[PDB]
Amino acid sequence: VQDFFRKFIEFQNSPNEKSLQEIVKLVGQLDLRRFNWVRDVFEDIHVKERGSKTALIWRDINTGEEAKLSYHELSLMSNRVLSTLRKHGLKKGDVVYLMTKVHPMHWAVFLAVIKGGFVMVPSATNLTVAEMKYRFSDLKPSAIISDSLRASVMEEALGSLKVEKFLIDGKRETWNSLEDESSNAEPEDTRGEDVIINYFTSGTTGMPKRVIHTAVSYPVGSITTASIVGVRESDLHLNLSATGWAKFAWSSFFSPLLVGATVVGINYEGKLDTRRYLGEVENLGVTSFCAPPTAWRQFITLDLDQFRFERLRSVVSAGEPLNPEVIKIWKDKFNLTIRDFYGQTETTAMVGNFPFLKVKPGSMGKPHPLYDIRLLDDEGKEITKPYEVGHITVKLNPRPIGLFLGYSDEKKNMESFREGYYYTGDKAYFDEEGYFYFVGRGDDVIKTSDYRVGPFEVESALLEHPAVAEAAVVGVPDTVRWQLVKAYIVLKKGYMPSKELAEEIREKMKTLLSPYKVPRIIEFVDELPKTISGKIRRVELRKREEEKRKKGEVGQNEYVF
Amino acid sequence: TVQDFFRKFIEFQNSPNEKSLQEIVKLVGQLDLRRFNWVRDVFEDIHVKERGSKTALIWRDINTGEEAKLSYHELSLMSNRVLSTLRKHGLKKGDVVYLMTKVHPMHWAVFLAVIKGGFVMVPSATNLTVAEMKYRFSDLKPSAIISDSLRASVMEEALGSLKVEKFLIDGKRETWNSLEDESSNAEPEDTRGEDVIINYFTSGTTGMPKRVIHTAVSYPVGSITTASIVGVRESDLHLNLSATGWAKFAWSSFFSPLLVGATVVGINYEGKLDTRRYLGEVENLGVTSFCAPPTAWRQFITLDLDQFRFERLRSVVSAGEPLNPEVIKIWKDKFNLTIRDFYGQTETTAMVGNFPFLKVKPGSMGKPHPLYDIRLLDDEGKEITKPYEVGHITVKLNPRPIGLFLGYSDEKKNMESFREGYYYTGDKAYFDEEGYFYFVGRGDDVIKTSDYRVGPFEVESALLEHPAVAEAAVVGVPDTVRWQLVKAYIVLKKGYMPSKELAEEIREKMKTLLSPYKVPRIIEFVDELPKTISGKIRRVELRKREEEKRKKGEVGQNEYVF
Amino acid sequence: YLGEVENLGVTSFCAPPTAWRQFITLDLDQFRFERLRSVVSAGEPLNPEVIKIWKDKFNLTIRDFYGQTETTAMVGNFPFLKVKPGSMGKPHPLYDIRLLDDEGKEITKPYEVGHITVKLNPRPIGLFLGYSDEKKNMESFREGYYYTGDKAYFDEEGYFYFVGRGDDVIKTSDYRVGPFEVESALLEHPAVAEAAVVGVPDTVRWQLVKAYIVLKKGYMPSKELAEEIREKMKTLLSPYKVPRIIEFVDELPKTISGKIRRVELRKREEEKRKKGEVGQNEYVF
Amino acid sequence: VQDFFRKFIEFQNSPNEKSLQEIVKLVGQLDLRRFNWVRDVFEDIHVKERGSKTALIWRDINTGEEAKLSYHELSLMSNRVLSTLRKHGLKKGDVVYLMTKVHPMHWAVFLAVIKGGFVMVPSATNLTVAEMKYRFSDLKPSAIISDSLRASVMEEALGSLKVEKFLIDGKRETWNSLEDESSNAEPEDTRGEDVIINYFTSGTTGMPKRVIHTAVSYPVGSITTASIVGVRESDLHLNLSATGWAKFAWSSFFSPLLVGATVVGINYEGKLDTRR
Ligand SMILES: CC(=O)OP(=O)(O)OC[C@H]1O[C@@H](n2cnc3c(N)ncnc32)[C@H](O)[C@@H]1O
């Protein structure tokens, strides 16, 4: 059980196809009835074997602060969290919202939750009072944990609920410290199928729902991720990614701590300083770096002769496609291939260009053998022809380990899991050597700037404005953000289409929505293309935008910001 | 136009029809209800003026024997002494008044005084516990409270030591006041039509009970729809069998009869309904229009019905639950009357109904009242255009119908009920090829035992108050007598063993916390509750399992029926 | 209960077919029963399929045996006796057991059904003294035989097979039930003019108690009435006796004399079963 | 053109070569895009024009039991079935195994299935636990329907697969009745090419496979059969065949009910007694 990860860690130091398959087989034979990744892996293969190796190197590029934590200090610090939580009467399964910046105490809380068998809800720091109140309606908090920078937002969204509140940095009235109880509490003997994580994620139909992950799905699924990423024990590993999302669990937390590596974490407020971040990469001698194509696109526009990166060995991308031209520029300069790979909040990494895999540009590589990946056509028959597009699906008998339990929405489960497959809602084709190529969403779900965006959620917030009668939100091609959020608005009788109105509505949306969700374009239209029932055909809104692009024509009341 | 409306309406009542209904509809739309006060404008200005000395109320208590008769005049006087006495104790417009009494003239009196004085009345039922009442006070603080002497201690204990003015409708008690102390002349409050006069605490599927907010027109003028479906006239003696703290008392014991200048008949009884004696009193008092709930109706038809003639009875009606086709038929075959079912919620007035002129199809609540825009929507929220297709009963909001509440005192609950231009009733139905509606059931987990709406969480909560109870799930189980039974599934804490004596001990505790209708009639102890991936109780599968067990007439291993 | 059987290492176990029927539905790989050597059933017939499932698993035959309150065991598959499924075995030599026909002559031919009787000269030892009721003695003790009121046939090896009651006595869930007792209790409801209680086939409980009720003038047939009457019966009758079905009828089939044909109420139920219909005023609980 | 069947029925009362050819040509001009033989032929022609003609005369030569059903009573009885199935949550295309003796309720269920757009899998009464398990491996049941004589075989072949189960004669624990619902359910608007029947047939190479029939292939193909057979409306028509095969549909069901005849059905257990 312990022996498994020691074999895994070796696999990493020189991986290949064949040895991967052995790893695969061995996972199937783990006994995972009672499992707790902190106790069993963190504490019993790292705190014990490398307890005073650096687990985490942290740095805030604004403040300048640095902090360095060994596997020991980190395990202690996390126990003080879990002791403090338990002291405030937190039983197993209790809900804990976690909204903090990148900071050691983030990792700490992660650990305390996993160990204590709590349900953590990662909450992003750019979430609005509105978004947070939505979350509370859907899943009531037993405790919430914030930094002092976003305490007001939680305080306001909470309103008049009893919860236990906690600050990771600084004091605030009726908030508590996390390091003031004893750094000894015991494991919760968790079932491997027990819930530890809920991720609110956007869908194509309704408001965002919780994706449910267990004490093995992420803690042991992340193998697939770690394996594609090619993170080793020797590595100093950084993931450019934010605090409320899956990619952090993926590569800022699980994948590095699985293999006993040194995590590198960098915090910044506001806008990313491309140069400053890359300076901190080189300056801290990171060896493995995962960043999103959004970031990569911005990096390659720097003067890259200002860097050596002698210490950097692995570079990876995920969440959107990776332009062949990006890959090439970075290679020609630093002699490294940015290895793209694929997955969702609902899963771990499912497909990827592994270290040992020859990259074909604009291909996310081949399936990880721990997922049974199939292209299905519209009728749900399996595609076994090259260059034919279909739905990316996961075969459910046997049920892969890294796959979420389901959504907190039983209807959405009925749409996504069926005839013994889970549909990712992504479309692709494969080639003659089994390399997969991402085509796009079969959904109306949007990805601006490596953020998953649900239409209804923006449409909803739009109907909050007195002027707005109807709204349809679609994503439009943009080289920098992949997609832009555009809104079609039908106006109530009484209001007329002006730029000043468009702006007024946008500024309203800024108080209700996460920035990435606030439409960059607004177009007033007399009506929305609809089916006979009255369902919006967001498909045809998109097609129409395309034909308009090819004749460089603006809509009559289309307002760009 | 404003007085003339009611005079046109009262005629529609004496002989109604499709076409003349539509005219009534149109005329309501052209009322000026910007500043309106139903007591001044209708009670006083029409009824007290034109029929001041006709009997407004005939009252009887079947237990005590006590009886009363009040004319529209005496009642208006009586009500003014109330309003004068309230004002004397410093009651301004919008002030909250809990009213917890038996059926009694002074109840009507207070209703009037409240509406006229522009106060916010909170109808409170007489079977509410100290606990329930304290909950209410946490949610809305009382400026004054009004009780009978039978439930004064309950108010006194739930109050604790809040400042309030207190009032007794029958007898003396220390620090309680009389309501007939000041002069029977104090003036209307000029209410806006949208001003609040009523708040109703109602159960939901999700949490503790919240307030439904009604205005000086929503009930006082919405009730038209009700009165119209009911078919109450001026010449009628109209009895509604309903208890004091709920929307149906307003609907049929108060507004619908007094709108059309009828004689109200009010019958009070404590405790358990004596079907044989109540129907004897109906006949004996020559009621002519009778609303009763299907629960009552179900009990009546089991009598030997050759005991009664019902010489004087011409209209019979039901509301609040479905009305079994077999009930309708038995009563018809005997007395040659159709019991007309009709539909609505605390949140509304009557929205759908078998009107007097409408051919009844049994097990249908009839057709929508044209003063509400009723739509069946499917799951995606698109309007249903096909017979025998089930969907959500909704109210279209532009324009906003008149009898519809303002909203809940809870903004989360408003966000659920008011969506994409529709207020969802959370009821499901299908219509037929002639546009008759058939009730299917709740989209919710809300329960209706014995014509009382019951919230699961409320009872689940009270159950966790018992040391032994680790988890609880409260569902309604099919029951012919009360439509649904409140059953609790209980997971036990380690230490306590599933026994009849334990089930009882828990139940008797729940009796001190919960209104009787809420106290589970069954308690079944289980190892676990079937759950989704979320942790949410599959009340779905609890019901399916109950069904398979019913077909083998077997109880669960530790299911205790009381 | 099965856990406690194993846990206490019982070696001989007698339960009724009702129990046995319920046991075989369990997942029976939970149990070893390493200490159990004898298993027996009595009070109603023992389905061949029950016997088989228990044998295939635990390697024991559930040995059926027959008797009544009035007696001790009169017929039975003894330990040494090859069990033929659906047979209660052979007569115990301390009772003189005879199949008689309706005319009271002894049946000596295989596969012919008759009344199970006990020959009384000399009088077997385990046989009750009689009833405290002289009428009931007149019916049971006749021409030097006690009639059990059970019907059976024997085969070519003298093995007895249960057919059913020649009475109107009912056996729900291994409890013997009298019609008149339930009919009596039913007259206690003001609405009830007459009542006829019969048993209807049920695989779980052998028979269900059904009541046919004629109503007094004034009351009309409803489900709500049926229920009201049943709930009343619950306060008067042991639960096994409380009718699971109530059917309102205009009249009860009668002979020329006016005697209720409970026989024909049963036959009618059978014809209805064979076209899978429930009745027009039959209310199932 | 439903006038087709009225022309067909007459063709039957006195056929010949020439008039046959007309029938042929008229079938080619049918609109079979949306079709439902129960609604369109059974109900709309026969129940309407001869509702109180005897549809079925039934006898069990072993028990003695006999039944006589008019086109009306049969249509009602079938609706009770379909109502009951729907009540247990049966959508169109759902699989229904049907294993019963020759009995009225068999025809009833046939009708309910065709009307309700279900996929029926006729299963003969002599099929073993093994053979039935094979069937379930190949196509999973949503519901199964048996007589009480073969309930244990279904129960055992199922093991504990979730299905709705139904008995045509008698009660049994966790089996449901078919006539406790309403005497009217609405037609399923079937496409003509929609599947309503699957028949497990033996072949040379493997274990048995399913033959797939549609809402027209049998319900309208049977014409050819009915025309060769020469069955008329006036006739009392008996087909000696067993319940889980094509020849039952062919001649105990479709060919007679196409032309509005009286079906005669005889049930026996065990070996055929040719002189009785
Ligand atoms: C067991 C007991 O004492 O029963 P008891 O309550 O006195 O009733 C006696 C009646 O039980 C029935 N009965 C008893 N044993 C049976 C068996 N092996 N097979 C079938 N029926 C059986 C008969 O019908 C008896 O006449």
Ligand SMILES: Nc1ncnc2c1ncn2[C@@H]1O[C@H](COP(=O)(O)O)[C@@H](O)[C@H]1O
């Ligand atoms: N390599 C990739 N190329 C294109 N899209 C990707 C890639 N990796 C992930 N995605 C998208 O990211 C989605 C999941 O979003 P999230 O759950 O936020 O990681 C997938 O459904 C894809 O649509």
Ligand SMILES: Nc1ncnc2c1ncn2[C@@H]1O[C@H](COP(=O)(O)O)[C@@H](O)[C@H]1O
């Ligand atoms: N006639 C009726 N038939 C069926 N359900 C009804 C009927 N009237 C009321 N109900 C139910 O009772 C609810 C009204 O609750 P209340 O606010 O207590 O009157 C409705 O939302 C229905 O779901």
